[PDB]
Amino acid sequence: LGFLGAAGSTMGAASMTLTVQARNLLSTVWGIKQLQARVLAVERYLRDQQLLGIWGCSGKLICCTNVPWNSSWSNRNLSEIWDNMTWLQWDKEISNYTQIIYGLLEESQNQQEKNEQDLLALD
Amino acid sequence: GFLGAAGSTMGAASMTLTVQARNLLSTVWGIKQLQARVLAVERYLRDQQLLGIWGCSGKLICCTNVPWNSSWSNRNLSEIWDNMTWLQWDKEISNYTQIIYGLLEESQNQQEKNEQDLLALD
Amino acid sequence: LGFLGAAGSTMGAASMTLTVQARNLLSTVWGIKQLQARVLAVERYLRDQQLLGIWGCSGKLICCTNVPWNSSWSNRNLSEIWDNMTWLQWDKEISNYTQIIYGLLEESQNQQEKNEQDLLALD
Amino acid sequence: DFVLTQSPHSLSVTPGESASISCKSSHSLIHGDRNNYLAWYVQKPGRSPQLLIYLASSRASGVPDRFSGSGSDKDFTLKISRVETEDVGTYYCMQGRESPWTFGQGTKVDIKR
Amino acid sequence: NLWVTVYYGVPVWKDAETTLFCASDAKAYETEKHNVWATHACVPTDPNPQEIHLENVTEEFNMWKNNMVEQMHTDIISLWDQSLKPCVKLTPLCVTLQCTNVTNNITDDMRGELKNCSFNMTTELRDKKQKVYSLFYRLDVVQINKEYRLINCNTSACTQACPKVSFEPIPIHYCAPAGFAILKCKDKKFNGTGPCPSVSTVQCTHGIKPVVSTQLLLNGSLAEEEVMIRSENITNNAKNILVQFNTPVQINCTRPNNNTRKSIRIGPGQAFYATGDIIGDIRQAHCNVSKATWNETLGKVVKQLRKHFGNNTIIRFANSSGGDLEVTTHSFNCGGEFFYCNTSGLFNSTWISNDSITLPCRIKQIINMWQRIGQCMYAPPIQGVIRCVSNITGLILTRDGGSTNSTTETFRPGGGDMRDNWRSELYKYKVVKIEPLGVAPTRCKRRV
Amino acid sequence: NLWVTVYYGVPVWKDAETTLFCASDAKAYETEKHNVWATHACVPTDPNPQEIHLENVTEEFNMWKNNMVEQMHTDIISLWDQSLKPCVKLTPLCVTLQCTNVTNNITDDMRGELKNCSFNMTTELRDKKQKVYSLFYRLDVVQINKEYRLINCNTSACTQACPKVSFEPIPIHYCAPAGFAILKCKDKKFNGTGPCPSVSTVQCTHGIKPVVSTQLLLNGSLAEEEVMIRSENITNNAKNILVQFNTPVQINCTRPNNNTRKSIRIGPGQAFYATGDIIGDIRQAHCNVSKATWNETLGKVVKQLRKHFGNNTIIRFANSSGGDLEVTTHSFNCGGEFFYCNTSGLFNSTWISNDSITLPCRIKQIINMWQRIGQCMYAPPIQGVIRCVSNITGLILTRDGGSTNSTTETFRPGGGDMRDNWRSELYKYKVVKIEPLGVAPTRCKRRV
Amino acid sequence: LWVTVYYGVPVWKDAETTLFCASDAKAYETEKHNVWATHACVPTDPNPQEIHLENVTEEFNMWKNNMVEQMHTDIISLWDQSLKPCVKLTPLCVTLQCTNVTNNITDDMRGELKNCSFNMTTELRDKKQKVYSLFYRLDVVQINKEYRLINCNTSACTQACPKVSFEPIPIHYCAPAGFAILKCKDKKFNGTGPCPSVSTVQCTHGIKPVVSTQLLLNGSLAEEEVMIRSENITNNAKNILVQFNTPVQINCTRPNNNTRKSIRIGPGQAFYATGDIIGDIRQAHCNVSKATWNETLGKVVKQLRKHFGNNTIIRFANSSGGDLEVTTHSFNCGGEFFYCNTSGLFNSTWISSNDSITLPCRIKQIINMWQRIGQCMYAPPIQGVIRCVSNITGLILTRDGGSTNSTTETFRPGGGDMRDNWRSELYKYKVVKIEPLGVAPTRCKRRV
Amino acid sequence: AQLTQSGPEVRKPGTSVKVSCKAPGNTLKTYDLHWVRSVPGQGLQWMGWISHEGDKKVIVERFKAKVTIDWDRSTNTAYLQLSGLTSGDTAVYYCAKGSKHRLRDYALYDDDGALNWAVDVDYLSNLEFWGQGTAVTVSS
Ligand SMILES: *[C@@H]1O[C@H](CO)[C@@H](O[C@@H]2O[C@H](CO)[C@@H](O[C@@H]3O[C@H](CO)[C@@H](O)[C@H](O)[C@@H]3O)[C@H](O)[C@H]2NC(C)=O)[C@H](O)[C@H]1NC(C)=O
Ligand SMILES: *[C@@H]1O[C@H](CO)[C@@H](O[C@@H]2O[C@H](CO)[C@@H](O)[C@H](O)[C@H]2NC(C)=O)[C@H](O)[C@H]1NC(C)=O
Numbered sequence A, C: 001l002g003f004l005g006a007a008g009s010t011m012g013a014a015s016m017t018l019t020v021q022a023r024n025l026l027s028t029v030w031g032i033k034q035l036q037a038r039v040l041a042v043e044r045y046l047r048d049q050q051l052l053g054i055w056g057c058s059g060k061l062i063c064c065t066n067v068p069w070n071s072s073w074s075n076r077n078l079s080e081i082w083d084n085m086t087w088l089q090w091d092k093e094i095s096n097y098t099q100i101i102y103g104l105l106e107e108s109q110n111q112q113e114k115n116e117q118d119l120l121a122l123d
Numbered sequence B: 001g002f003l004g005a006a007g008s009t010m011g012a013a014s015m016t017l018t019v020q021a022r023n024l025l026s027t028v029w030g031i032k033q034l035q036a037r038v039l040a041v042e043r044y045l046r047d048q049q050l051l052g053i054w055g056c057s058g059k060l061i062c063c064t065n066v067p068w069n070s071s072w073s074n075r076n077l078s079e080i081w082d083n084m085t086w087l088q089w090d091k092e093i094s095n096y097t098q099i100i101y102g103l104l105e106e107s108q109n110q111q112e113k114n115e116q117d118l119l120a121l122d
Numbered sequence D: 001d002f003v004l005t006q007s008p009h010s011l012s013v014t015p016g017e018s019a020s021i022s023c024k025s026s027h028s029l030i031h032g033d034r035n036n037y038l039a040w041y042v043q044k045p046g047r048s049p050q051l052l053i054y055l056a057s058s059r060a061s062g063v064p065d066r067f068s069g070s071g072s073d074k075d076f077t078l079k080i081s082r083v084e085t086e087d088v089g090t091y092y093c094m095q096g097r098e099s100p101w102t103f104g105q106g107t108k109v110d111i112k113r
Numbered sequence E, F: 001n002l003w004v005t006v007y008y009g010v011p012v013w014k015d016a017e018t019t020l021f022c023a024s025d026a027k028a029y030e031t032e033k034h035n036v037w038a039t040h041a042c043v044p045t046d047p048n049p050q051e052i053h054l055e056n057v058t059e060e061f062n063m064w065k066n067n068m069v070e071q072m073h074t075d076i077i078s079l080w081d082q083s084l085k086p087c088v089k090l091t092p093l094c095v096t097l098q099c100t101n102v103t104n105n106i107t108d109d110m111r112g113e114l115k116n117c118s119f120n121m122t123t124e125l126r127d128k129k130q131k132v133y134s135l136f137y138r139l140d141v142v143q144i145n146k147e148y149r150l151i152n153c154n155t156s157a158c159t160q161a162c163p164k165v166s167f168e169p170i171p172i173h174y175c176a177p178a179g180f181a182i183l184k185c186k187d188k189k190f191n192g193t194g195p196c197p198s199v200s201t202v203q204c205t206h207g208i209k210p211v212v213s214t215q216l217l218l219n220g221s222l223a224e225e226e227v228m229i230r231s232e233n234i235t236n237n238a239k240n241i242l243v244q245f246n247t248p249v250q251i252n253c254t255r256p257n258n259n260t261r262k263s264i265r266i267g268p269g270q271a272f273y274a275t276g277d278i279i280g281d282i283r284q285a286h287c288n289v290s291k292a293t294w295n296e297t298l299g300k301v302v303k304q305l306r307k308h309f310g311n312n313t314i315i316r317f318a319n320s321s322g323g324d325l326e327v328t329t330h331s332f333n334c335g336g337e338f339f340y341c342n343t344s345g346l347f348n349s350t351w352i353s354n355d356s357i358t359l360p361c362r363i364k365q366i367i368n369m370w371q372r373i374g375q376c377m378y379a380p381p382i383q384g385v386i387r388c389v390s391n392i393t394g395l396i397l398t399r400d401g402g403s404t405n406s407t408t409e410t411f412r413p414g415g416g417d418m419r420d421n422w423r424s425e426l427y428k429y430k431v432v433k434i435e436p437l438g439v440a441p442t443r444c445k446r447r448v
Numbered sequence G: 001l002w003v004t005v006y007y008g009v010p011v012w013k014d015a016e017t018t019l020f021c022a023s024d025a026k027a028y029e030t031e032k033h034n035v036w037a038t039h040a041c042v043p044t045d046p047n048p049q050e051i052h053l054e055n056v057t058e059e060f061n062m063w064k065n066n067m068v069e070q071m072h073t074d075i076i077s078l079w080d081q082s083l084k085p086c087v088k089l090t091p092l093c094v095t096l097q098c099t100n101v102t103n104n105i106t107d108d109m110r111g112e113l114k115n116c117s118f119n120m121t122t123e124l125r126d127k128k129q130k131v132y133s134l135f136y137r138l139d140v141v142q143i144n145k146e147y148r149l150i151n152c153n154t155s156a157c158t159q160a161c162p163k164v165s166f167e168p169i170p171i172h173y174c175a176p177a178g179f180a181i182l183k184c185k186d187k188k189f190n191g192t193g194p195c196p197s198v199s200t201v202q203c204t205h206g207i208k209p210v211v212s213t214q215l216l217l218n219g220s221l222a223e224e225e226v227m228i229r230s231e232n233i234t235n236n237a238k239n240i241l242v243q244f245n246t247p248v249q250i251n252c253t254r255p256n257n258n259t260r261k262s263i264r265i266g267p268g269q270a271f272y273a274t275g276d277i278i279g280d281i282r283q284a285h286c287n288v289s290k291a292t293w294n295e296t297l298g299k300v301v302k303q304l305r306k307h308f309g310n311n312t313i314i315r316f317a318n319s320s321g322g323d324l325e326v327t328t329h330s331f332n333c334g335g336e337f338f339y340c341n342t343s344g345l346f347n348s349t350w351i352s353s354n355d356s357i358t359l360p361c362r363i364k365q366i367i368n369m370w371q372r373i374g375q376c377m378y379a380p381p382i383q384g385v386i387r388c389v390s391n392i393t394g395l396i397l398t399r400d401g402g403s404t405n406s407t408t409e410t411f412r413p414g415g416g417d418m419r420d421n422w423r424s425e426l427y428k429y430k431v432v433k434i435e436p437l438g439v440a441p442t443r444c445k446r447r448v
Numbered sequence H: 001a002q003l004t005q006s007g008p009e010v011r012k013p014g015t016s017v018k019v020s021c022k023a024p025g026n027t028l029k030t031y032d033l034h035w036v037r038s039v040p041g042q043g044l045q046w047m048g049w050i051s052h053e054g055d056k057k058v059i060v061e062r063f064k065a066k067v068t069i070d071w072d073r074s075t076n077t078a079y080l081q082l083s084g085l086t087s088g089d090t091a092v093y094y095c096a097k098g099s100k101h102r103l104r105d106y107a108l109y110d111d112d113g114a115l116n117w118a119v120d121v122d123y124l125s126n127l128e129f130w131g132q133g134t135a136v137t138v139s140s
């Protein structure tokens, strides 16, 4: 029920508690420690926020995308994934394929931005 | 001006939200600068993060699916929006703030899964 | 391709690759001046996002608004811009009126964020 | 450094001979290596004393080179070569090592006949 | 019926503590004279600070528990320490001195105040020594058992005040960081605590001069309508009374001697600035106050102190109760000299239902300033005659006694604590933090 | 028909290195006791723990590659230095000493162990003589020729420890920045490496006392249900073995001599605390351990080494191989006095398959901590008699010999590193970075 | 036509910011600290990612460039930081007794070295030692056979730490996020105006902080022609920069085989004197080739007449004089400082081969580096013979200017301020500030 | 060259005697001041000295009870003062001027080589100038 507590539970059951993890990502020469640390925290949070913002998911915790799921990435059935697996396992299977995916998410977005602007201009 | 309507009524101030929002950010004297700046950025982001999980995330006025419990306050709208002040409003409802803030978090997640279940049936 | 690589391409073609620039805006002698730079980069980055957040464009790389164009700023037609110019020199032409246009976009937003909620409070 | 003693109380010398008088020191009297602080004076009858040798070997200005001194660290002696009539008198050795500074008892010289 | 609605940008605030930062008058930037508490390295102030009025809003103030004074006290001391890190340290000066009176042409009142001392100091070559002499004030030397020493040699080694740095109190503006706001109390009859029915908001405070003085507040800001008496609890003797004048009274001070400054070199690149000799007659330093004007200002203060202790009670003024020089005398510095004046002639009167007052003064060169022990400074002499004119705008007083009734009240000067001085300037300010998130009931319901 | 859905806030972590920050309790903070591990840095700690248990979770630990231990080593060293900066530097003590043995009342065990030394010095004035004397321990003086000097003169001049600071270890908590987490292993059988089936997360670590010791771990945390043996390459010979007890062994120590202080004055505002003279008779310092409860403990340690080394191998314990006094002896300080004691009485036995022990100790006053060169410290003497009692919670052991496959094993005490003292506490903890973005397949589409 | 809002447009404008250093990670393998602080400098990228910009015609300016001003402060600040942990030679300011060295000397070196003896301190405060050291003539001054070190009447010098290296290492300058560094790629860029071949880089090319005078060493070469650059080309108070398209090698050597000697002047700190010289004593010098140098001047003249006319006579002279720091070719060769008489190169008149030119050089051990007065450095001697080979890639010139005459132009070597050196490397680069927001008309409108 | 003393004296017991010894003009000011006593058969004896710098002055503890030396710097006059005379105080009094060696036998130095304090000791080199005598006779 607390922070990070659902790390060992089913994937579907873990996604019910996204807010608990989401809240905690942010909060004399010797003491520059307590300033180096905080600046780092801010710019790490902004990196994830920007990375979502240029995917179309501005303020959404569970955001859908139009990218087709290449079967070469993972071949499991949805019952094999969302019912009887843990997020710390899924991280192992997709790590290699992760970097490319952020590309497809980014490619698909500006297409919609250009498309929708054209459709509004068609008015 | 900035905080220029602190004595006006709640309704009167509601159209002056932008003037406040713009002003929430941006060797003895030198080490003072770094401390002050990193304090301002962190405070700004907490409001934006908190205001985002509630589902507003881009808006200064935002409705919510949580009804108003009578226990929080009972007085009428003809007795609030035109004769109270925000500085006075925070005095009425102080203890409940952290309890209300815990509701909007759940209300949004139900929406997030519901507007995701209502997309999977296609 | 490349950061700022479209600086010499036309206004119409350089607008197709806005993501490469935006994604690059936030990427003890040399120990104390470093931090005074990192904080500044974050400070400027939030200045842009705040402005976009009060015009309603808080999550888009392309955004259109209901503020009418005034010819006294620039009367030229798309037959004279958007395909025969560059972003570098348009800034020079339109710079003289930016302080104004940024202001209309604000009032034009609270003009919408209240009328929108007035419908939910009625229906 | 307290007391100094001279071995011969009386001395008789035939002209043309050499003379030798020795002063014995109770304590070191040497500061270090090169410096020895002993001096030799003469008091001819009915006159003021006179300076002959200092720093235990150095000869004063105006003293004929027949006067020669040698010694170091508790052994010193003053030699006169081919003594003459005007060598009659009394010789005192003085020590400058430590206060109070003291004289020797005195050696008395007389022409031999 | 009613659904919660969240508003971002509502005007609300709460008391808070934060680190304020200095802002400097831009017109002093070009001087580049490198004074203490550098006004450079501050953020230059804009030419037109913006005051915002807040109509019919009432706010609570408390000047005594204000945190701003604590920060200023901690800042000023910090600035003072840095300003004399680099330059000379007078450890070699702790030798034995051979001193004798100076009586060449001296007034009867200055008979034995300064002495002529000789000491064997080092040269720029470490293996040679030179014999030099200097003039020292009697307060700066003590007999060992005519062999003297500097007072501090058994407590600490003093740092020579740094010859090209000025002690002048340039005004300093205090600014709040983004997300915090400063409120000013515009009321004229404000007694330091309680409601302030007229408030305003400012970006930064006015210029505040870091003037350092005792028993009299100098070059301060005046009141607007009436002489004001302030205190935490008037019924307590042990807590000070602060007075603010509505008008100024001038105090003129001067050291009338023609000093000569002589450089002595005690090491490679280091010099000791000694006082050589007096060109002319030797006279006592003094300050003047108008007799006719002090006689009436005290008339008001009694008139305003009757509102507390009764229309009929007899009010008396007495000189300092007792103590060391730093607290028992009116201390200050003009130009570079540190004066310790005898204010027993101002506080001398008894009130029942063209001349000048001439206060004698003494001088010191070994200064402790902030009431620290083990940390010291040495102020070098200044060539020529020095004269200064200043306002007087407030007093620091303390009442005493009282047995079985209030039959005759008496007041005395005091106030060796240096932060009571600035509390007389920062009494109209407070710092708050903004809380721009508000939730209110409304009919509106989200679409889905 | 499967589409990518992105989640933000998923519970995923990855090993990482980051700068932890210190926290401490308010008992010393409220009165400014000024401990060496000063609370000026560490922030006030949380009012209560907030640990969270994680079911189903398995994590891979490694106590020997932990970055936490390295980050603790540097900070303990840094905090030590910054406490010594303001204290007086004993540069004028490097003169020729003229010493003679103290013969008054001496136990035969320590004939000629401390000496009566005299030397020239200046008083608070530069040019005035002063002759002083002090007792020194024989380990602090080296002959130059009956003339001596302090051991440190030809390497460096070190600073006297300020009398008002204290070395007593107060617990300090290490807390993680935002975006990071600490995983604590709760397994009772953990051997320092491999998976931990009972992981839990905590805001930050428990109180850890920065004790300094050698050959024996004092005032530590006990194991549970059994004695534990931890080593990374047990079959090596250049790899130490860390033994943790499940029940303490009590050690009492004392320095019976009744010493007296003497504050010498050297320079303006500086003082040197000599050892004065001793009241009574001179006796040896020593520590006591119970013969019954110590060889009841070696019998429990051996039964665990029998697991790693065969069911019938004959074990053996021996005293240190050799080297410097700081590594061949059980070093520590209690009561502000540094002890170097001979542990040859405890590590002497053979296991084949009251009578409390006394350990004589020697004291020193010139201290070279952290194995650095060119930087020492001087320990002021302590008035009166000093005594201390402490738990023993672990040993540092080093094996030797490979002459046979398995006939016997000879164990000796270690002390070649200082991180070993803190790997006995930070073995349960590790730091992980949180990566909250994740992408999974599910049947969904972006409408419109 | 309604206002659109664009984010991420490629627009920029000029502004100044704090660039940060980047250095090769391969240099970490050397393990030896240097003045230029490789450890403090950020690690550099594996390889640059330069991007070309078509259609772009940015405007450049090399003289009003803020990048060079920053590099000046960085270099000085790094220099000062490196000398803090080294020895302050305060006890070296004592009377010296010196005699000429005449043992196996040549004619030209007669009187240039001196044999000085002096008392000096030791590790014990109450003893001194008699030592001797060879000192160059330029370092000592007389006290009217008794001498002193020259710096003693100005300040005390800091001995350079013997381990650190003065050897330059490349440093890259990088712009922070949101800024960019534009680079010019025109082969004929005269320092100001359009650059039709702009490009952007993450960091500049490796730049060596070489310090020189009257000649630029180990620099960058031009392409296809010798390039001349200046601000106000008809101004006699302006320096002229010449950049070669091909280098001319200069060989420098110090033939004497001298030996370093160590003297202990305090506890833990030593002074490094010159012990003796093995064999004959000769003069240091540098060599250039007549055949190759002459053709370089012939290329340098050709471009000079293009500004001053085809019929103009041109001359080269040997400078109008000054102190050795500015009137000579001054540089550092393997830890030893040289000062060479450059009169043999600049001696010619133009009117339209295995040989050498030898330049006699002096040596100096007391160094004032950045034209400051008050900070001096003592460079310790170096064992054995030393030799240096280096490119010559530039030339700093000044113009005397004719009065009522035009048919002869005479040039001399200059040197100016030290920052003229780095303008020869940072002329290509400028820093710009990105501006990602824009507004433009389009047909779009918002719905509802 | 030589020094000149005051003429002979004849004083009854109990009284006091001053003896003068003066150098030609200012020809000897860098030499120290010494006094010697002669009594026939008792030999030469050393009484006391004054350093030309004025930093030292001593008298043998035998004579220190009654005798005192003065050196009037301005007039270059040397005085020997005798008081409480007795029949054994009849003697002939000489004045001498000679050189000395001053050697720093110990010194305590600062961190930067500066001198804090030191002990310089005076050793006697020679007595090279002499007076003529002063026959003090004590009788009834
Ligand atoms: C490049 O350097 C030259 C100097 O070598 C500069 O030319 C000088 O410019 C000044 C300022 O305009 C001239 O002063 C004026 O001259 C006339 C004299 O009749 C008059 O109008 C004014 O009273 C004033 O004195 C000066 O004469 C002129 N010197 C020469 C030799 O022509 C030139 O400005 C520099 N270029 C740049 C771009 O800075
Ligand atoms: C544990 O320690 C033993 C030494 O006792 C290591 O065994 C040696 O490993 C090296 C390196 O591979 C070989 O060259 C030796 O021949 C090995 N010696 C024996 C006796 O086997 C062993 O590798 C260590 N284990 C680990 C994981 O480091």
Ligand SMILES: *[C@@H]1O[C@H](CO)[C@@H](O)[C@H](O)[C@H]1NC(C)=O
Pocket: F191, F192, F193, F194, F195, F231, F232, F233, F234
């Ligand atoms: C510790 O436990 C791990 C995991 O079972 C095992 O591999 C290892 O051998 C054990 N012992 C040591 C000394 O590592």
